[PDB]
Write a protein that binds this ligand. Structure first.
Ligand code: UP6
Ligand code: UP6
Lengths: 211, 211
């Protein structure tokens, strides 16, 4: 909805529920990561899904060996997540393990190819095109790419095709622009610009109207 | 969305996709049953979920022995359904088997307590209150009750409490009224009044505005 995904990284349940409820009319998809899950428990995923009737993407940056990745994905989907974000840099076998569980459980894998922060230029950027091509070869249809580098987002879009779904973080606080990012991504992920705002609903409304 | 769930019982993929796309702005939840699945395959569930970004309730009226019920639910959730409708009349063990799989896969079970058609008065109605109480005892939080008998829907709402989620079919073609049904149910299910209409979008819009 509105091509906007809320990155809910507040660490306490009450604040997370308050902000998510305030901006629900503008979204239908919430990205929940370890900051909230490690503080309040995996049960928070089912609670959000039920209370807000939104889709939940678990941003767990899965980056282990195949066998452990299988275990992490199974627990995550058992908890009710609709999709999970997985790193591609640990290799194809590690990604395939995630895809196997998603297939078994009727869920989806998002492949993270290039990250949005400054440090991403050190090692990830140099491998990003190859990671995206690996995703295509494995049948991945959902990807994550950087708002902070639209030229890289364009290159990623080029590799994955127009039929793949691409979401992009780094919007707002990290420097990314909503409109420019949406020239290439299907949806933008926004965390701090909304959840640290004095009026999260007004902040979400502003982003939606700017695009 | 709009407390309206589309019962997509057309049997061919092209017509089903056309009508669902035409009314998508009014809904966010589609009920898919055997008329469409047995004609086009279980893969239609993932296709709808992806193409329309809606939640999918599989109306499979699960009504077998525990072991078979477990198999049916597993295949259904593997196919991507968010929830499954199960009959309560075959007993508690049969329902528990469904709840066990839903727990394993992070999904939901809707318990059907009293049906909406005339024949429901023969045997189901007499057992309906006990079936609803069984659901409460088993921890069921989602229920299906009849639009065609609001006094029975009221009795069912009484047993399950205000915190349980109740959806109700029999609206329109079978005689049920949207507004009266919503006095007790959280959402109404509508099939033919929308999918056989000359203008499904206008029909959906009319129902939404009447409530
Ligand atoms: O390359 C990536 C991948 N993931 N995220 C995540 O997306 C969200 C962005 O939040 P922000 O809007 O507050 O910067 C956070 O949950 C963060 O972990 C990034 O920021 N960059
Ligand atoms: O008690 C019940 C349970 N399920 N349904 C189902 O709900 C839908 C109602 O469709 P309709 O609006 O076309 O009558 C159909 O898929 C039907 O199998 C009923 O009608 N009554």
């Amino acid at each position: 909805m509105n091509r906007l995904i809320l990155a809910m990284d507040l660490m306490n349940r009450d604040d997370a529920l308050r902000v998510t409820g305030e901006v629900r009319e503008y979204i239908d998809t919430v990205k929940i990561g370890y900051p909230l899950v490690l503080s309040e428990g995996m049960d928070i995923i089912a609670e959000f899904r039920k209370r807000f009737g939104c889709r939940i993407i678990a941003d767990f940056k899965v980056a282990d060996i195949p066998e452990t990745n299988e275990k992490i994905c199974r627990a995550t989907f058992k908890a009710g997540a609709d999709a999970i974000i997985v790193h591609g840099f640990p290799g194809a076998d590690s990604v395939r393990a995630c895809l196997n569980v998603a297939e078994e459980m009727g869920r989806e894998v998002f492949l993270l190819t290039e990250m949005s922060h400054p440090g991403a230029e050190m090692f990830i950027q140099g491998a990003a095109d190859e990671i995206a091509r690996m995703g295509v070869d494995l049948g991945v249809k959902n990807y994550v790419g950087p708002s902070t580098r639209p030229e890289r987002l364009s290159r990623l879009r080029e590799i994955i095709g127009q039929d793949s779904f691409l979401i992009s973080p780094g919007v707002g606080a990290a420097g990314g622009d909503p409109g420019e990012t949406l020239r290439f991504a299907d949806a933008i992920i926004v965390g701090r610009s909304i959840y640290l705002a004095d009026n999260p609903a007004a902040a979400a409304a502003g982003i939606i109207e700017s695009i």
